[PDB]
Amino acid sequence: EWEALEKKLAALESKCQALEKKLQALEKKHEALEHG
Amino acid sequence: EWEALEKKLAALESKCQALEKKLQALEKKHEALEHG
Amino acid sequence: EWEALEKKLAALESKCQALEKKLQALEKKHEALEHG
Ligand SMILES: [Cl-]
Ligand SMILES: [Hg+2]
Ligand SMILES: [Zn+2]
Ligand SMILES: [Zn+2]
Ligand SMILES: [Zn+2]
Ligand SMILES: [Zn+2]
């Protein structure tokens, strides 16, 4: 049913969110290099 | 039903696509640093 | 039915995984710059 699907979708949302935080930290490193 | 699920899946696809574009821009910054 | 949904979910999982590998390679470049 939808239970397996909803849990798979919730797990991918959490993975995407954790990747986004790591991508924002890389963006902040470039900002810090670009402004001395 | 599938309506809530399909909309959740479409929203995650758009989020993943927007993260990919930001990741390609970081990749281009490294390419520009590596070639002077 | 679930067939279209499950295949869409599997395709997004593979895309997210491939983006994660590219994000880990960018993280390794910063580690290599930060340690000489
Ligand atoms: Cl980066
Ligand atoms: Hg993602
Ligand atoms: Zn970088
Ligand atoms: Zn700036
Ligand atoms: Zn190059
Ligand atoms: Zn280090």
Resolved by: X-ray
Give the other-Cβ count within 10 Å of B19's Cβ: 20
Please state, in angstroms and rounded to a whole number, the distance separating the CA atoms of residues A15 and A9. 10
Task: Please tell me which chains touch A, using 3 or more CB pairs under 8 Å as the contact test.
Answer: B, C
Please state, in angstroms and rounded to a whole number, the distance separating the CA atoms of residues C1 and B28. 41
Please state, in angstroms and rounded to a whole number, the distance separating the CA atoms of residues C36 and B12. 38
Dihedral sign, CA of A4, A6, A7, A8? positive
Please state, in angstroms and rounded to a whole number, the distance separating the CA atoms of residues B26 and A25. 12
The label of the residue with tokens 């710059």 reads C33
Please state, in angstroms and rounded to a whole number, the distance separating the CA atoms of residues B17 and C2. 23
Please check whether residue B9 touches C, CB under 8 A. yes
Resolution (A): 2.1
Dihedral sign, CA of C28, C31, C35, C36? positive
Please state, in angstroms and rounded to a whole number, the distance separating the CA atoms of residues C9 and C1. 13
In chain B, residues with a C-beta closer than 8 Å to the C-beta of C23 are: 23
Sort C14 into a burial class: Cβ within 10 Å, 0-12 / 13-18 / 19+.
exposed
Q: Where are chain B's structural domains? A: 1-36
